[PDB]
Amino acid sequence: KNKCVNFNFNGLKGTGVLTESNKKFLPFQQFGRDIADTTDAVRDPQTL
Amino acid sequence: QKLIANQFNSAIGKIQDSLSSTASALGKLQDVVNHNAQALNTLVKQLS
Numbered sequence: 001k002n003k004c005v006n007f008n009f010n011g012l013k014g015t016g017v018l019t020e021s022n023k024k025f026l027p028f029q030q031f032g033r034d035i036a037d038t039t040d041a042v043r044d045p046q047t048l
Numbered sequence: 049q050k051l052i053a054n055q056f057n058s059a060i061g062k063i064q065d066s067l068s069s070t071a072s073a074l075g076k077l078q079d080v081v082n083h084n085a086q087a088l089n090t091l092v093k094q095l096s
């Protein structure tokens with residue numbers, strides 16, 4: 001974490017800095033988006 | 049001279065109370081910010 005890292009979250013290729021979320025997700029939510037159609041937060045498939 | 053000075057002070061003192069009311073006195077300066085914000089949010093929303 002806290003570094004510019006190429007990530008691949010269940011087939012989602014991207015490039016960014018992975019920091020802590022600090023927002024309450026409901027337990028049925030996998031993705032997280034913004035005003036545009038870009039993924040802003042992904043739930044981890046292993047450590048949840 | 050005292051009447052002119054008193055009327056000038058009464059006209060200057062009513063400027064702040066007129067600008068603190070009617071909710072659209074500074075709308076010409078709010079429009080140039082609300083147009084740029086709308087033109088930027090349109091560029092954000094056209095990526096979806």
Ligand SMILES: *[C@@H]1O[C@H](CO)[C@@H](O[C@@H]2O[C@H](CO)[C@@H](O)[C@H](O)[C@H]2NC(C)=O)[C@H](O)[C@H]1NC(C)=O
Pocket residue numbers: 046047048
């Ligand atoms: C993949 O690994 C993670 C991390 O070890 C597993 O998550 C934990 O698994 C243990 C035992 O299976 C549970 O007691 C914990 O509650 C789990 N923690 C979380 C946050 O899920 C995960 O189970 C593993 N995947 C599979 C399919 O077993």
